[PDB]
Design a protein around this ligand. Sequence first.
Ligand SMILES: *[C@@H]1O[C@H](CO)[C@@H](O)[C@H](O)[C@H]1NC(C)=O
Ligand SMILES: *[C@@H]1O[C@H](CO)[C@@H](O)[C@H](O)[C@H]1NC(C)=O
Length: 361
Amino acid sequence: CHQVRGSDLQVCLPKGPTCCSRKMEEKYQLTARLNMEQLLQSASMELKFLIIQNAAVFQEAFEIVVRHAKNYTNAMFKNNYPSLTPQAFEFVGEFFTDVSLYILGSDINVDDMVNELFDSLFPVIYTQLMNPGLDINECLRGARRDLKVFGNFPKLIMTQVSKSLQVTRIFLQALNLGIEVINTTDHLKFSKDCGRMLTRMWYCSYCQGLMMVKPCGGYCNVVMQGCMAGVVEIDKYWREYILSLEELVNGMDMENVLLGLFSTIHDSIQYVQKNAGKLTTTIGKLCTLSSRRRELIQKLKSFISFYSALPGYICSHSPVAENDTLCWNGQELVERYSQEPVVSQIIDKLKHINQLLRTMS
Ligand SMILES: *[C@@H]1O[C@H](CO)[C@@H](O)[C@H](O)[C@H]1NC(C)=O
Ligand SMILES: *[C@@H]1O[C@H](CO)[C@@H](O)[C@H](O)[C@H]1NC(C)=O
């Protein structure tokens, strides 16, 4: 043994003498772990950055659309229903606040936003528009629904906005989930047998005192196919996630729906006032964007074989003798080579988001 870069070892199969002890064997084991990790990192980096890019852009683009709709809706109220301000400035803000929250994954029930909106809207219509001239607020909030003053305008808005806010939410959910599974890949822990085999493949030749010999490609594939056995099962679910995503995008907006809200609300106010006469009395008694989507799907399809091409990536981006001549077989230099929990969580997450994508478009 010159420079290197009995027997009681536990990894390197000792044909006879050996250059390395049990302690240098443990060194070689940890550097195999570090090496596999770096390689997995490099495999997943470009795809990870792609989805990180678009998740950040699309989130702001959608946030811009909500802010613009809020101000337009606020301005339309200020201009057409000044008697309803400043109260309108408050329930419009309440609604679009929940819009963004619902878009970004918060537990928000759409039927509320609409119902809270109309529950807040009706008392100020009654007091300021229908019968001009504080303790009686809660009665009017209850009579709004008990007397169905807006007809089916709330249901109409409910379906108008729930369909458009659901697709936008799920699109952001799927982008962030892809980041989360791909980022999990470079942290995948493998079996101890795989680690011992990786050590034999990459480093045990130095223990026999060889300097330039590389492992056989065939030996690398048998080793890698054995290491990535659970990982390759993820391929079919990843391909369905890509295709389901491509389905959603080809089917697509939220701007028109949210911009159109004031028009629908205004007609709902007109409906109510068509009944002010009798309604007062009873209440008296009672009381390039699309271009970005395309380019993302284009780049995303180029990575559709990520999990199936992964073992080949590790073998090709490490020194191997793909020729299978004068190569290291794990225990001797040969002339020609002859012969889950975390994974299941990735599966489950891909299954869940793939249902959500399917049943949308
Ligand atoms: C548009 O709406 C958003 C809502 O948060 C607000 O921050 C922004 O200042 C508005 N722009 C105006 C009022 O010019
Ligand atoms: C990636 O995974 C690591 C470890 O699991 C975690 O610390 C990090 O926050 C994750 N990053 C993203 C963007 O998911």
